[PDB]
Design a protein around this ligand. Structure first.
Ligand SMILES: Nc1nc2c(ncn2[C@@H]2O[C@H](COP(=O)(O)OP(=O)(O)CP(=O)(O)O)[C@@H](O)[C@H]2O)c(=O)[nH]1
Ligand SMILES: [Mg+2]
Ligand SMILES: [Mg+2]
Ligand SMILES: [Mg+2]
Ligand SMILES: [Mg+2]
Ligand SMILES: [Mg+2]
Ligand SMILES: [Mg+2]
Ligand SMILES: [Mg+2]
Ligand SMILES: [Mg+2]
Ligand SMILES: [Mg+2]
Ligand SMILES: [Mg+2]
Ligand SMILES: [Mg+2]
Ligand SMILES: [Mg+2]
Ligand SMILES: [Mg+2]
Ligand SMILES: [Mg+2]
Ligand SMILES: [Mg+2]
Lengths: 62, 99, 83, 208, 622
RNA sequence: UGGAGAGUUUGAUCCUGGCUCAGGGUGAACGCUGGCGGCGUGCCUAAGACAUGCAAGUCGUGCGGGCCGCGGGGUUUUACUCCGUGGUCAGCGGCGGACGGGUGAGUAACGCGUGGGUGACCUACCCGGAAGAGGGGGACAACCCGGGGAAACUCGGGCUAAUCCCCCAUGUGGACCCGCCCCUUGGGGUGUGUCCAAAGGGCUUUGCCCGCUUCCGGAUGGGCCCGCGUCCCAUCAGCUAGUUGGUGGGGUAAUGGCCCACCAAGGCGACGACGGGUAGCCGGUCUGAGAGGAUGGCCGGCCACAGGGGCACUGAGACACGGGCCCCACUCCUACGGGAGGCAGCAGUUAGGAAUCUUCCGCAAUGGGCGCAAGCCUGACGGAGCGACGCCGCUUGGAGGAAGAAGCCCUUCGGGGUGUAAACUCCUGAACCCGGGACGAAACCCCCGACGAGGGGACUGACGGUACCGGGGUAAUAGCGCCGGCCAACUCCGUGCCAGCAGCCG
């Protein structure tokens, strides 16, 4: 099992995923994170601060 | 497809027969001599040894034997000839080996 | 046979050779018997060709062949001139 | 590198007047005079007493900001000082101060160290006759540091060498305002520079 | 440009692959389920030279299932040849390839092929060409023998005629027209000239005056008309039996456009403004990848058309369409028998590249350092049928999906998706025959064996009478209008219904850890006492059909448990709107195609849920 | 010239003690972002499978032929195609293909490291020295002929040349038995007996150049041996039949149970035999105050391997990476008769993977092979390309510019912050464009001298119209992480054990 970080996500039953390592002091037996922004894991929408975790492209300042 | 290391192969095969010939000859004669030395037939034992010696040395000339190898072959032949004879003996055909 | 030849050192666009004696069969940049000179084909410094003549002569006398390019450089430091 | 971006804003924060604009950071203006407090929404609040870390961070940052040098270049420069012979603190300054961009400022061919960088970098400076455009260039005892013959009469250079008639150039140096030549005589003694920097705390910064 | 890029497109089994195969032979004088199933499925470009003229040919498949292979050649090629089973006329998939040629503005000739077969009649083709697809055909030649004795071809225009002795194209050679046909010949020259009149005016005038114009200026006047897409020269022959093919090739070099004779295509710069791409070999590079192939022996092969510039082998280029830097590692030309590696590929030219890892069809390539323009590409189209796929034994699960990803990359009419409710992998294509060759491609090509089957449906449940209850606290539960909507304990037993276990919906709960367990046991009960009913997705469907078929189409919709909603025209045909349960809509596209002789289409969009016909449910508690 | 600690068990305390963090590092990978250059560096996984090209040849001054382009006239010339030379083609014969290049699978071992030993040995080409190169024969390809084949090509019969083979001679010398002297493991000498050599080619030719033979010495490279050093499990404690030793053989360059007969019953093991697991080893590298710990990609040295396994042949050397045989695995062509194949060479494809490049340029340099030489070959190599992968360097302006615009944030509604930051004035001038333009290349060769030394001449550049110099010349990319404590950096809003954060405390 693997944590899906970020507010909101788009993972479903055959979504392909990049696993990362890093556990979560809180979910037992979750030793891994999903790398947002890669394969079928979308970035995190509206994210503006820690954007490179959370795989979020730099938003346009039109 | 083709390299002419094929040549080197064609050639190895010729030499392989050439040396086979000289080598098997050297053993038939070396054997023959020790055999005769044991029967006590010293004129012909020494007679043959000389032939064997010649052929071994002849072989040292090119790739077939070389070196300490021929010398060794020779050494063991006359060590083995001289002694078998010596048990009966007298070195009749004074040829071949030192007084 | 054994050779007197240029081993490449220095760096990219910075050739600096060592004049070295070595079995012919080593790789060019490999182990070598003895160092005798060094050579910098671009003369970026005044001491750009050096050779230990009295050693090169030892090596020539025991049958080391020099490279064309090496010969040229030993000649130039008078390994070959005999008075 | 060289930062690029607001300066007499760390002329502040370090809380102590570096000289990043040369000429203005002398007017009733280096903001040290006006707003001698840190930038930002806070800055004029209760100062919380500094951690031992912050003490040194700041001291390190102070020195670095003075010369306009990247932290990678700085640490390198420093680690070199440490390996080098005798007092790491003093030596390290001497290496900072041996820099070309800074030598040029100490000669007053340029007003600010930023400026000196830009001058060096644009071919206007020459060391021992050949032209150098590497701010990081290390200047050695005995070097002639001049202004390029083609640059000799530029608006900025005459202004700046006009102000050098009058002034004394730091003891470890010589200057020839008429002919625009300078000589790096020896390495700067720890006292020759009145630096607002306890360099011993900078050594200690790099000890962690 | 001394260079002709031409597709061969036609109904199924009209003879394109054979035609092509003969073109490469004449121009030569100095494939798995395609076997099994007997069809063309993948087309490749191929070069040959006719009269010091470079001909690039794409032999296209006929089936709807592979429309994508036309929707593709019809882009990147400049001119088409449209074949006909002249014993059959214009068939429904001729109509299709035609309207595709229409939308890319593709100058074209026709080829009444199979003039040898029992029934084969040019006039069938001609009439039907005009009756069924609105075209203006122009008789450029005539035959010598009603079907069985079709022995030679009159060329009107040049007044000349050829007869073939064998069915081998090894004893051809000119003859004069015979006495008969000679009255028939004329009558077209003049009648071509009648038509050419509208193009040259020097012919217009020269017509009126009873003066037959010059051979070259007619050709130019015809050709001009072909390229303005107002005239469709018709040629005839038998590809099988080597009759009219050389003539056909001549006719390609006479009337079919060289890249200069067609508007150059358009693109969209990063700024945003449209712009034409000058077709200069020394301009920047712009180019369109239109096919990926996984080929041993060179690996991934990417076929491209160069519009502007000179694509030079051993460079880097930029896929503007997906912004990756790609490498042309070598460039390639497919001849009839071998593949020429070439150093470059200039404007107007097609080839294949190796290198190139990300680029797919429609994707645009430009120079390494060039104006990142994005070219008008290729056009979806959209899949009509879909099925659950799962492997017979899992572990093969990975092989299966890795493949479908490969395959959805080669061909973008094939999609893979995952039903969001029950996570089964849903595969979709352009027909039964499509999906069959895909599955039959997973076994042979990818060593993965799968089952296929109807997607199971997203059911719902609700109640049908209001209710009051005690959960041990009390609640009232009424229904609501179809499609309405809807404490934390109750939304939680809303998951599983009583009947099948799908979500409960469209109800109002009125209340009048500990709290949680009580709502959950209350509503769980309310739904039973409320006396429920299964709801099931209903799709709004609009199908499009020539009016011929309406009755039978509608009848079958009613037969699918539907409810028709109305019917308007859209252009030359007629639309029918209706609601039908998703369930009964399985394999609709291929039933529809049987009822409309492949002329119908349809689309489908979720609309609402609604209760069932009291037959299922029991037959659904199962 | 060298050494920092902090959070967390308690109501609180001290101690114990684990967990956790700050640092450095990497062949990296992934995310956001990305401007330049230099030097490095880039399949860590499937020692999986590989389309295609190239990676080892060269000598006509070893030899005889086929074909071609010429010169010079044969019947005057095309039909009998004749001499001379300059090309090409295989063949025969040499030297090279044992080096260079790849990889880390196996190997826990004299494999490696380190120091030694060989009276127990070898070393092609190179050098020094001595003495020869004198007689004769012969065959196999090429070539022609035929049978065979779809072809690959394959068999048979016959011709033939040489630096190919063979015999004979001379024996400077060498080998061998035996005896003698010295020496001391088989080292040096000596006597008689026996046994052993050789090849010619080219020129301007009674002289030069290249080769051939024997011996001695040198140099270089090797083989074999020994001391010591070389990971985890003892929940592996006993191991061993060529096993330990002897004798006599065989084998090899050479010692040796290396192999074989015979005899004896040994040999090894808690100082860890045997077994199982892991691993190529080192110079170094990373870390560390050090001692240590970890590692062994790149570069150098040694070893091993070349689809898996065995085997030998040729040879100075191989049990042979682009040589051979067989077995096995796998693939390819096929006319169904049979054939062919081995990227862990450079590129590249495909698969596996989080992930790793051009099917690039050039032999100008350095090095290698062959050649008298000219020169040929050289994916060694020198370069270019791609990748922020790494390190170093450089830019995105500089100086002026308000008690301080606007916007945006805070606000105790006076202000405060962004901020000299901008706007604005001057100044400079990355990129660009123009002109010029390298070093790296002087040898080999040629001429004088003697084809020595020494003097003189000629050719030669992939990178590259590149670096760099000169002249013009534009204000010209900035982003990423963090701001509860460790830890440098705080306010407002939204949110309300939800959404979410999280390395630990939380
Ligand atoms: N009598 C006759 N038959 C022909 C002729 N050309 C093709 N055919 C027949 O139709 C078959 C059509 O095969 P093909 O030529 O591949 O047609 P196609 O249209 O390419 C098939 P798809 O559309 O599936 O690719 C031929 O084998 C033959 O059976 C023709 O000239 N004369
Ligand atoms: Mg955060
Ligand atoms: Mg016998
Ligand atoms: Mg049909
Ligand atoms: Mg077809
Ligand atoms: Mg069919
Ligand atoms: Mg306790
Ligand atoms: Mg990017
Ligand atoms: Mg040892
Ligand atoms: Mg023995
Ligand atoms: Mg041997
Ligand atoms: Mg291993
Ligand atoms: Mg320590
Ligand atoms: Mg392999
Ligand atoms: Mg190979
Ligand atoms: Mg993959």
């Amino acid at each position: 099992t693997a944590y899906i970080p970020g507010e909101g996500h788009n993972l479903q039953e055959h979504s392909v995923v990049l696993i990362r390592g890093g556990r979560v002091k809180d979910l037992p037996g979750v030793r891994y994170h999903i790398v947002r922004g890669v394969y079928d894991a979308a970035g995190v929408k509206d994210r503006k601060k820690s954007r490179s975790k959370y795989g979020t492209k730099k938003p346009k300042e039109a | 497809r083709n390299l002419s290391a094929l040549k080197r192969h064609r050639q190895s095969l010729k030499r392989r027969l050439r040396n086979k010939a000289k080598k098997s000859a050297i053993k038939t004669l070396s054997k023959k001599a020790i055999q005769l030395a044991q029967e006590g037939k010293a004129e012909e034992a020494l007679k043959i040894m000389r032939k064997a010696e010649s052929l071994i040395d002849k072989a040292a000339k090119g790739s077939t034997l070389h070196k300490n190898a021929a010398a060794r072959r020779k050494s063991r032949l006359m060590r083995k000839v001289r002694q078998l004879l010596e048990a009966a003996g007298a070195p009749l055909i004074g040829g071949g080996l030192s007084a | 046979m054994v050779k007197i030849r240029l081993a490449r050192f220095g760096s990219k666009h910075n050739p600096h050779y060592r004049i070295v004696v070595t079995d012919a069969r080593r790789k060019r940049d490999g182990k070598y018997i003895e160092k005798i000179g060094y050579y910098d084909p671009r003369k970026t410094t005044p001491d750009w060709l050096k050779v230990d003549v009295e050693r090169a002569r030892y090596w020539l006398s025991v049958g080391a062949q020099p490279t064309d390019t090496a010969r040229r450089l030993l000649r130039q430091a008078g390994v070959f001139r005999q008075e | 590198g060289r930062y690029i971006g607001p300066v007499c804003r760390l002329c502040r924060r370090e809380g102590v007047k570096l000289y990043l604009k040369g000429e203005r950071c002398y007017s009733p203006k280096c903001a040290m005079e006006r707003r001698p407090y840190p930038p930002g929404q806070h800055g004029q609040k209760r100062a919380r007493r500094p951690s031992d870390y912050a003490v040194r961070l700041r001291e390190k940052q102070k020195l670095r900001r003075i010369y306009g040098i990247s932290e990678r270049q700085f640490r390198n420069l420093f680690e070199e000082a440490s390996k080098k012979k005798g007092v790491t603190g003093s030596v390290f300054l001497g290496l900072l101060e041996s820099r070309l961009d800074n030598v040029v400022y100490r000669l007053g061919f340029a007003v600010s160290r930023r400026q000196a960088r830009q001058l060096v970098r644009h071919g206007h400076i020459t060391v021992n006759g050949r032209r150098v455009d590497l701010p990081s260039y290390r200047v050695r005892p005995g070097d002639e540091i001049a202004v390029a013959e083609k640059s000799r009469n530029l608006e900025l250079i005459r202004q700046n060498l006009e102000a050098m008639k009058g002034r004394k150039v730091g003891p470890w140096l010589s200057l020839d305002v008429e002919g625009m030549k300078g000589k790096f005589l020896r390495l700067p003694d720890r006292e020759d520079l009145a630096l607002p920097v306890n360099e011993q705390l900078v050594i200690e910064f790099y000890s962690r | 440009k001394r260079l002709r890029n031409i597709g061969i497109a036609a109904h199924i089994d009209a003879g394109k692959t054979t035609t092509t195969e003969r073109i490469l032979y004449y121009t030569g004088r100095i494939m798995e389920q395609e076997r099994e199933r007997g069809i063309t499925i993948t087309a490749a470009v191929t070069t040959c030279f006719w009269k010091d003229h470079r001909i690039n040919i794409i032999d296209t498949p006929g089936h709807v299932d592979f429309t994508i292979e036309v929707e593709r050649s019809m882009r990147v090629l400049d001119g088409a040849i449209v074949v006909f089973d002249s014993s059959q006329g214009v068939e429904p998939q001729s109509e299709t390839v035609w309207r595709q040629a229409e939308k890319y503005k593709v100058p074209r000739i026709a080829f009444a092929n199979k003039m040898d077969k029992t029934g084969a009649d040019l006039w069938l083709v001609i009439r039907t060409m005009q009756e069924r697809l609105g075209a203006r055909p122009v008789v450029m030649q005539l035959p010598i023998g009603r079907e069985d004795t079709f022995s030679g071809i009159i060329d009107v225009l040049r007044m000349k005629a050829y007869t073939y002795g064998n069915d081998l194209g090894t004893d051809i050679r000119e003859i004069p027209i015979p006495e008969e046909y000679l009255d028939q010949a004329r009558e077209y020259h003049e009648k071509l000239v009648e038509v050419a009149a509208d193009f040259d005016e020097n012919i217009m005038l020269k017509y009126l005056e009873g003066e037959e114009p010059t051979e070259e200026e007619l050709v130019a006047a015809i050709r001009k008309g072909t390229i303005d897409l107002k005239i469709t020269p018709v040629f005839l022959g038998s590809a099988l039996k080597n009759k009219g093919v050389q003539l056909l090739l001549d006719a390609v070099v006479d009337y079919l456009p060289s890249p200069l004779d067609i508007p150059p295509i358009k693109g969209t710069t990063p700024e945003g403004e449209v712009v034409e791409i000058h077709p200069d070999p020394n301009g920047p590079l712009a180019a369109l990848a239109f096919k990926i192939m996984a080929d041993p022996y060179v690996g991934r092969l990417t076929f491209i058309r160069v519009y502007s510039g000179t694509l030079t082998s051993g460079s880097y280029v930029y896929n503007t369409t997906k912004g990756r830097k790609e490498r042309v590692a070598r460039l390639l030309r497919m001849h009839a028998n071998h593949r020429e590696e070439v150093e470059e590929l200039k404007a107007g030219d097609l080839g294949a590249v190796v290198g190139l890892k990300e680029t797919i069809t429609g994707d645009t390539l430009v120079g390494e350092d060039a104006p990142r323009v994005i070219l008008e590409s290729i056009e979806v189209p959209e899949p009509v049928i879909d099925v659950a796929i799962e492997p017979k034994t899992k572990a093969d699960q990975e092989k299966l999906s890795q493949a479908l990803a490969r395959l959805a990359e080669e061909d973008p009419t094939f999609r893979v998706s995952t039903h969001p409710e029950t996570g089964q992998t849903i595969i979709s294509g352009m027909g039964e025959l499509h999906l069959e060759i895909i599955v039959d491609r997973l076994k042979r090509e990818f060593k993965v064996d799968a089952n296929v089957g109807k997607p199971q449906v997203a059911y719902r449940e609700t109640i049908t009478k209001p209710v009051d209850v005690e959960g041990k606290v009390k609640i009232k539960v009424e229904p609501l209008p179809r499609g309405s909507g809807f404490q934390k304990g109750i939304e939680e037993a809303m998951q599983s219904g009583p009947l099948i276990g799908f979500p409960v919906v469209d109800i109002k709960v009125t209340l009048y850890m500990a709290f949680k367990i009580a709502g959950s046991m209350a509503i769980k009960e309310a739904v039973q006492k409320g006396d429920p009913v299964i709801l099931e997705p209903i799709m709004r469907v609009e199908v499009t059909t020539p009016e011929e078929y309406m009755g039978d189409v509608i009848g079958d919709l009613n037969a699918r448990r539907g409810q028709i909603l109305g019917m308007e025209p859209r252009g030359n045909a007629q639309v029918i709107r209706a609601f039908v349960p998703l369930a009964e809509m399985f394999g609709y596209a291929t039933d529809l195609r049987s009822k409309t002789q492949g002329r119908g289409s349809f689309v489908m969009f979720f609309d609402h849920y609604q209760e069932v016909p009291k037959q299922v449910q029991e037959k659904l508690i199962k």
